[PDB]
Design a protein. Sequence first.
Lengths: 119, 152
Amino acid sequence: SELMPGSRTYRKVDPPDVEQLGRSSWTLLHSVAASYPAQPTDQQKGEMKQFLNIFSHIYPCNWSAKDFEKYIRENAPQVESREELGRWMCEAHNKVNKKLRKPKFDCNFWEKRWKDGWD
Amino acid sequence: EGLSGRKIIYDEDGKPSRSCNTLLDFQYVTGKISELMPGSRTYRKVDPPDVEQLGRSSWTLLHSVAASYPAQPTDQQKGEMKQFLNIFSHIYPCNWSAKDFEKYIRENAPQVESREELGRWMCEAHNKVNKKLRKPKFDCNFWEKRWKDGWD
Ligand SMILES: Cc1cc2nc3c(=O)[nH]c(=O)nc-3n(C[C@H](O)[C@H](O)[C@H](O)COP(=O)(O)OP(=O)(O)OC[C@H]3O[C@@H](n4cnc5c(N)ncnc54)[C@H](O)[C@@H]3O)c2cc1C
Ligand SMILES: Cc1cc2nc3c(=O)[nH]c(=O)nc-3n(C[C@H](O)[C@H](O)[C@H](O)COP(=O)(O)OP(=O)(O)OC[C@H]3O[C@@H](n4cnc5c(N)ncnc54)[C@H](O)[C@@H]3O)c2cc1C
């Protein structure tokens, strides 16, 4: 709300809660999926697996990071194509929605929501 | 300390916690110390995030990652953090920006020995983009207040 000393721009905005961090993490995760190649190289396939493994270790919320890691074991990420990684990212997201009684996102429209837009 | 209130479950760190609890509920505890997408009525059709939206959404995570970082991290956490930033610099959606950030890591290696080192590094990295975009230079001495603790 009110400014920092001694900035004439940056304000005393509080550290993110679950919701502010959540939608910010989802927008990155889904945007990474959208930028993923149709035919990824072995290095890209390896790093995508790594990034998500590390992600589940360091996520700011601790047992949400555990829940995500446990999800990765029970549901291995498909990194063979953008379409698979994106659909997997949507299905991974859909589980958190189910836990929060938020409606299911139609994964048929993940590529519009995160890559293409709607005409 | 309240276990349940306002419908949701409270996570407690040493005591207060921040990242795992909603804003309205966090105040509640610290105060106690004294058109639509087809097939769904719920989700509006939303255009994908632009450079600016993705950018600031990536920063809030990256600094929150620095905020959660331990004071004395294990050797695994140091190496994983290093990889995390490298992989990030490759797979960051904006290619022309990702290549720049990758070059920054080459020239200015991440200091991951402590949270104090990492937040200071992250702030400087953010500040380099700040100068490139002609935004004001953020005071790193206040990164903890902005991203970790709050403003008392
Ligand atoms: C890994 C992870 C674990 C989390 N765990 C918890 C937790 O345990 N408890 C908790 O309270 N919060 C948790 N969160 C935060 C939570 O998931 C939400 O992000 C937060 O509650 C804010 O939700 P929102 O209503 O603003 O929209 P969000 O759920 O953040 O989604 C933002 C936008 O993305 C789109 N979207 C939603 N679902 C999908 C999907 N299936 N596929 C494609 N697009 C979609 C929608 O259009 C929506 O507008 C977690 C977040 C992450 C990233
Ligand atoms: C790795 C990376 C590289 C990027 N490269 C480019 C690029 O090359 N060109 C481009 O146009 N865009 C780039 N972006 C996006 C750009 O940095 C901004 O995020 C975007 O322009 C939105 O700016 P903003 O002013 O709305 O918020 P941001 O500049 O993203 O800042 C968000 C919040 O963080 C806080 N903050 C600001 N500076 C610091 C700091 N130094 N340390 C700690 N906290 C701070 C402030 O409170 C601010 O409200 C990049 C993003 C990332 C994550």
